[PDB]
């Protein structure tokens, strides 16, 4: 799904930064990938939406670090 | 209950008090950290435990930042 792919793009961006804050974001993103698969299998749209918002905020953080 | 989970649960209560989507995002991250840390402990992965301890530290700093509002 698009979630996993966007999250993996974000993971590659975090990997390029090579700092503890970027490692923390990378780990959170791996966890979100697994969480989002579980929520989809669960049929939990609320948790899916929560994880989409997490992805948006993690990406904004990555952007800031990339500045 | 382990000391990591206790630290994460206190941070989860503070995030619930903040009641904004950023705080809800942090709350969700902390729940996932608790489960990740239990798994890392079972595996004896000291490095992953340290990464998760740092994640908890950074999440708490974000929560602190919000709480001065």
């Amino acid at each position: 799904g698009e979630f996993e792919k966007r999250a993996k793009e974000l993971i590659e961006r975090a990997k390029k930064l090579n700092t503890p804050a970027a490692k923390v974001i990378e780990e959170a993103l791996k966890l979100f990938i697994e969480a989002y698969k579980e929520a989809k299998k669960k049929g939990d749209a609320l948790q899916q939406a929560l994880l989409e918002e997490s992805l948006a905020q993690a990406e904004e953080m990555l952007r800031r670090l990339e500045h």
Side-chain angles (χ1 to χ4, degrees), chain A residues 24-42:
Chain A
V24 162
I25 290 152
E26 171 180 30
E27 164 67 19
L29 290 161
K30 298 167 168 300
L31 298 177
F32 299 162
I33 287 178
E34 295 313 313
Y36 186 88
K37 299 175 164 168
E38 276 328 276
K40 197 105 217 148
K41 187 200 247 146
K42 269 298 176 40

PDB file of all heavy atoms in Angstrom, chain A residues 24-42:
ATOM      1  N   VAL A  24      15.871   7.953  15.449  1.00  0.00           N
ATOM      2  CA  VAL A  24      14.638   7.850  16.225  1.00  0.00           C
ATOM      3  C   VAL A  24      13.428   7.889  15.296  1.00  0.00           C
ATOM      4  O   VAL A  24      12.490   7.090  15.435  1.00  0.00           O
ATOM      5  CB  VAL A  24      14.593   8.956  17.295  1.00  0.00           C
ATOM      6  CG1 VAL A  24      13.173   9.159  17.824  1.00  0.00           C
ATOM      7  CG2 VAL A  24      15.510   8.608  18.450  1.00  0.00           C
ATOM      8  N   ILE A  25      13.444   8.801  14.318  1.00  0.00           N
ATOM      9  CA  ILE A  25      12.329   8.891  13.372  1.00  0.00           C
ATOM     10  C   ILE A  25      12.247   7.640  12.502  1.00  0.00           C
ATOM     11  O   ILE A  25      11.153   7.138  12.211  1.00  0.00           O
ATOM     12  CB  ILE A  25      12.464  10.168  12.521  1.00  0.00           C
ATOM     13  CG1 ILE A  25      12.214  11.401  13.391  1.00  0.00           C
ATOM     14  CG2 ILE A  25      11.538  10.137  11.330  1.00  0.00           C
ATOM     15  CD1 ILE A  25      12.937  12.635  12.921  1.00  0.00           C
ATOM     16  N   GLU A  26      13.398   7.121  12.066  1.00  0.00           N
ATOM     17  CA  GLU A  26      13.410   5.894  11.274  1.00  0.00           C
ATOM     18  C   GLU A  26      12.746   4.746  12.021  1.00  0.00           C
ATOM     19  O   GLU A  26      11.923   4.015  11.455  1.00  0.00           O
ATOM     20  CB  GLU A  26      14.850   5.530  10.915  1.00  0.00           C
ATOM     21  CG  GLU A  26      14.997   4.170  10.277  1.00  0.00           C
ATOM     22  CD  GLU A  26      16.435   3.861   9.953  1.00  0.00           C
ATOM     23  OE1 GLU A  26      17.324   4.358  10.682  1.00  0.00           O
ATOM     24  OE2 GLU A  26      16.668   3.112   8.988  1.00  0.00           O
ATOM     25  N   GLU A  27      13.107   4.563  13.298  1.00  0.00           N
ATOM     26  CA  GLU A  27      12.522   3.490  14.106  1.00  0.00           C
ATOM     27  C   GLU A  27      11.015   3.662  14.262  1.00  0.00           C
ATOM     28  O   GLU A  27      10.247   2.693  14.130  1.00  0.00           O
ATOM     29  CB  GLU A  27      13.200   3.458  15.483  1.00  0.00           C
ATOM     30  CG  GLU A  27      12.448   2.661  16.549  1.00  0.00           C
ATOM     31  CD  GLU A  27      12.432   1.186  16.239  1.00  0.00           C
ATOM     32  OE1 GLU A  27      13.289   0.757  15.439  1.00  0.00           O
ATOM     33  OE2 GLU A  27      11.552   0.467  16.763  1.00  0.00           O
ATOM     34  N   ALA A  28      10.575   4.891  14.555  1.00  0.00           N
ATOM     35  CA  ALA A  28       9.137   5.137  14.653  1.00  0.00           C
ATOM     36  C   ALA A  28       8.432   4.765  13.355  1.00  0.00           C
ATOM     37  O   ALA A  28       7.341   4.184  13.369  1.00  0.00           O
ATOM     38  CB  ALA A  28       8.883   6.607  14.985  1.00  0.00           C
ATOM     39  N   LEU A  29       9.049   5.085  12.218  1.00  0.00           N
ATOM     40  CA  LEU A  29       8.425   4.794  10.927  1.00  0.00           C
ATOM     41  C   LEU A  29       8.304   3.295  10.675  1.00  0.00           C
ATOM     42  O   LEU A  29       7.291   2.835  10.124  1.00  0.00           O
ATOM     43  CB  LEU A  29       9.221   5.457   9.811  1.00  0.00           C
ATOM     44  CG  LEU A  29       9.144   6.983   9.744  1.00  0.00           C
ATOM     45  CD1 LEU A  29      10.305   7.504   8.919  1.00  0.00           C
ATOM     46  CD2 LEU A  29       7.792   7.461   9.191  1.00  0.00           C
ATOM     47  N   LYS A  30       9.339   2.519  11.035  1.00  0.00           N
ATOM     48  CA  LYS A  30       9.235   1.054  10.933  1.00  0.00           C
ATOM     49  C   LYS A  30       8.066   0.522  11.775  1.00  0.00           C
ATOM     50  O   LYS A  30       7.260  -0.327  11.319  1.00  0.00           O
ATOM     51  CB  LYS A  30      10.554   0.407  11.380  1.00  0.00           C
ATOM     52  CG  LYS A  30      11.794   0.783  10.536  1.00  0.00           C
ATOM     53  CD  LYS A  30      13.094   0.347  11.269  1.00  0.00           C
ATOM     54  CE  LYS A  30      14.368   0.401  10.425  1.00  0.00           C
ATOM     55  NZ  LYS A  30      14.342  -0.450   9.214  1.00  0.00           N
ATOM     56  N   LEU A  31       7.926   1.055  12.990  1.00  0.00           N
ATOM     57  CA  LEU A  31       6.838   0.645  13.873  1.00  0.00           C
ATOM     58  C   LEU A  31       5.469   1.007  13.280  1.00  0.00           C
ATOM     59  O   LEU A  31       4.506   0.241  13.394  1.00  0.00           O
ATOM     60  CB  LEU A  31       6.991   1.296  15.259  1.00  0.00           C
ATOM     61  CG  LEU A  31       8.264   0.902  16.008  1.00  0.00           C
ATOM     62  CD1 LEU A  31       8.413   1.632  17.352  1.00  0.00           C
ATOM     63  CD2 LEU A  31       8.272  -0.603  16.225  1.00  0.00           C
ATOM     64  N   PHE A  32       5.391   2.170  12.653  1.00  0.00           N
ATOM     65  CA  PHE A  32       4.128   2.638  12.050  1.00  0.00           C
ATOM     66  C   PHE A  32       3.747   1.708  10.901  1.00  0.00           C
ATOM     67  O   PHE A  32       2.601   1.450  10.691  1.00  0.00           O
ATOM     68  CB  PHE A  32       4.196   4.034  11.492  1.00  0.00           C
ATOM     69  CG  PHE A  32       4.498   5.154  12.380  1.00  0.00           C
ATOM     70  CD1 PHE A  32       4.937   6.362  11.828  1.00  0.00           C
ATOM     71  CD2 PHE A  32       4.385   5.066  13.769  1.00  0.00           C
ATOM     72  CE1 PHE A  32       5.242   7.448  12.616  1.00  0.00           C
ATOM     73  CE2 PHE A  32       4.677   6.172  14.576  1.00  0.00           C
ATOM     74  CZ  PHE A  32       5.117   7.370  14.008  1.00  0.00           C
ATOM     75  N   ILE A  33       4.732   1.290  10.118  1.00  0.00           N
ATOM     76  CA  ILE A  33       4.450   0.370   9.010  1.00  0.00           C
ATOM     77  C   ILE A  33       3.749  -0.876   9.542  1.00  0.00           C
ATOM     78  O   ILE A  33       2.664  -1.283   9.047  1.00  0.00           O
ATOM     79  CB  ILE A  33       5.744  -0.046   8.252  1.00  0.00           C
ATOM     80  CG1 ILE A  33       6.270   1.112   7.403  1.00  0.00           C
ATOM     81  CG2 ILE A  33       5.474  -1.291   7.401  1.00  0.00           C
ATOM     82  CD1 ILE A  33       7.545   0.818   6.666  1.00  0.00           C
ATOM     83  N   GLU A  34       4.349  -1.477  10.576  1.00  0.00           N
ATOM     84  CA  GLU A  34       3.732  -2.692  11.112  1.00  0.00           C
ATOM     85  C   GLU A  34       2.362  -2.391  11.728  1.00  0.00           C
ATOM     86  O   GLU A  34       1.390  -3.152  11.530  1.00  0.00           O
ATOM     87  CB  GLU A  34       4.651  -3.357  12.136  1.00  0.00           C
ATOM     88  CG  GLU A  34       5.962  -3.873  11.547  1.00  0.00           C
ATOM     89  CD  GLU A  34       5.756  -4.666  10.259  1.00  0.00           C
ATOM     90  OE1 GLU A  34       4.871  -5.549  10.221  1.00  0.00           O
ATOM     91  OE2 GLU A  34       6.461  -4.377   9.272  1.00  0.00           O
ATOM     92  N   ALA A  35       2.258  -1.267  12.450  1.00  0.00           N
ATOM     93  CA  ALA A  35       0.993  -0.872  13.080  1.00  0.00           C
ATOM     94  C   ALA A  35      -0.108  -0.654  12.053  1.00  0.00           C
ATOM     95  O   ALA A  35      -1.269  -1.003  12.293  1.00  0.00           O
ATOM     96  CB  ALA A  35       1.181   0.414  13.889  1.00  0.00           C
ATOM     97  N   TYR A  36       0.241  -0.058  10.915  1.00  0.00           N
ATOM     98  CA  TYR A  36      -0.753   0.257   9.894  1.00  0.00           C
ATOM     99  C   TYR A  36      -1.238  -1.011   9.202  1.00  0.00           C
ATOM    100  O   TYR A  36      -2.433  -1.146   8.901  1.00  0.00           O
ATOM    101  CB  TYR A  36      -0.165   1.257   8.889  1.00  0.00           C
ATOM    102  CG  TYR A  36      -1.164   1.756   7.882  1.00  0.00           C
ATOM    103  CD1 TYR A  36      -1.962   2.865   8.150  1.00  0.00           C
ATOM    104  CD2 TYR A  36      -1.334   1.100   6.665  1.00  0.00           C
ATOM    105  CE1 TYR A  36      -2.901   3.310   7.226  1.00  0.00           C
ATOM    106  CE2 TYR A  36      -2.270   1.536   5.740  1.00  0.00           C
ATOM    107  CZ  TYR A  36      -3.047   2.631   6.028  1.00  0.00           C
ATOM    108  OH  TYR A  36      -3.966   3.061   5.111  1.00  0.00           O
ATOM    109  N   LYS A  37      -0.330  -1.958   8.947  1.00  0.00           N
ATOM    110  CA  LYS A  37      -0.793  -3.241   8.430  1.00  0.00           C
ATOM    111  C   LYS A  37      -1.772  -3.895   9.394  1.00  0.00           C
ATOM    112  O   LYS A  37      -2.834  -4.389   8.979  1.00  0.00           O
ATOM    113  CB  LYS A  37       0.388  -4.168   8.155  1.00  0.00           C
ATOM    114  CG  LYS A  37       1.360  -3.629   7.131  1.00  0.00           C
ATOM    115  CD  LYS A  37       2.585  -4.532   6.997  1.00  0.00           C
ATOM    116  CE  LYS A  37       3.347  -4.222   5.713  1.00  0.00           C
ATOM    117  NZ  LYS A  37       4.693  -4.861   5.672  1.00  0.00           N
ATOM    118  N   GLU A  38      -1.444  -3.892  10.692  1.00  0.00           N
ATOM    119  CA  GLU A  38      -2.350  -4.497  11.659  1.00  0.00           C
ATOM    120  C   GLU A  38      -3.702  -3.782  11.679  1.00  0.00           C
ATOM    121  O   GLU A  38      -4.747  -4.432  11.724  1.00  0.00           O
ATOM    122  CB  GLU A  38      -1.712  -4.505  13.048  1.00  0.00           C
ATOM    123  CG  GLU A  38      -0.771  -5.685  13.295  1.00  0.00           C
ATOM    124  CD  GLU A  38      -1.190  -6.953  12.559  1.00  0.00           C
ATOM    125  OE1 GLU A  38      -2.045  -7.692  13.097  1.00  0.00           O
ATOM    126  OE2 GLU A  38      -0.671  -7.215  11.447  1.00  0.00           O
ATOM    127  N   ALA A  39      -3.705  -2.446  11.638  1.00  0.00           N
ATOM    128  CA  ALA A  39      -4.972  -1.715  11.681  1.00  0.00           C
ATOM    129  C   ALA A  39      -5.831  -1.993  10.441  1.00  0.00           C
ATOM    130  O   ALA A  39      -7.064  -2.046  10.535  1.00  0.00           O
ATOM    131  CB  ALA A  39      -4.711  -0.215  11.829  1.00  0.00           C
ATOM    132  N   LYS A  40      -5.199  -2.113   9.267  1.00  0.00           N
ATOM    133  CA  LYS A  40      -5.926  -2.452   8.044  1.00  0.00           C
ATOM    134  C   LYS A  40      -6.545  -3.840   8.151  1.00  0.00           C
ATOM    135  O   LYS A  40      -7.727  -4.032   7.851  1.00  0.00           O
ATOM    136  CB  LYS A  40      -4.993  -2.364   6.836  1.00  0.00           C
ATOM    137  CG  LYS A  40      -5.733  -2.307   5.498  1.00  0.00           C
ATOM    138  CD  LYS A  40      -5.700  -0.891   4.910  1.00  0.00           C
ATOM    139  CE  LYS A  40      -7.012  -0.521   4.200  1.00  0.00           C
ATOM    140  NZ  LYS A  40      -7.304   0.941   4.301  1.00  0.00           N
ATOM    141  N   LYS A  41      -5.749  -4.832   8.562  1.00  0.00           N
ATOM    142  CA  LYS A  41      -6.308  -6.154   8.832  1.00  0.00           C
ATOM    143  C   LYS A  41      -7.419  -6.079   9.886  1.00  0.00           C
ATOM    144  O   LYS A  41      -8.413  -6.820   9.810  1.00  0.00           O
ATOM    145  CB  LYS A  41      -5.193  -7.121   9.246  1.00  0.00           C
ATOM    146  CG  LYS A  41      -5.657  -8.602   9.393  1.00  0.00           C
ATOM    147  CD  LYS A  41      -4.709  -9.430  10.247  1.00  0.00           C
ATOM    148  CE  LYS A  41      -4.017 -10.482   9.395  1.00  0.00           C
ATOM    149  NZ  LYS A  41      -2.612 -10.763   9.827  1.00  0.00           N
ATOM    150  N   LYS A  42      -7.258  -5.209  10.890  1.00  0.00           N
ATOM    151  CA  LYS A  42      -8.253  -5.006  11.955  1.00  0.00           C
ATOM    152  C   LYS A  42      -9.549  -4.330  11.461  1.00  0.00           C
ATOM    153  O   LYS A  42     -10.622  -4.448  12.088  1.00  0.00           O
ATOM    154  CB  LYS A  42      -7.679  -3.996  12.996  1.00  0.00           C
ATOM    155  CG  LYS A  42      -6.843  -4.226  14.307  1.00  0.00           C
ATOM    156  CD  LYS A  42      -7.356  -4.993  15.464  1.00  0.00           C
ATOM    157  CE  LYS A  42      -6.248  -5.115  16.521  1.00  0.00           C
ATOM    158  NZ  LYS A  42      -5.518  -3.826  16.613  1.00  0.00           N
TER     159      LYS A  42
END
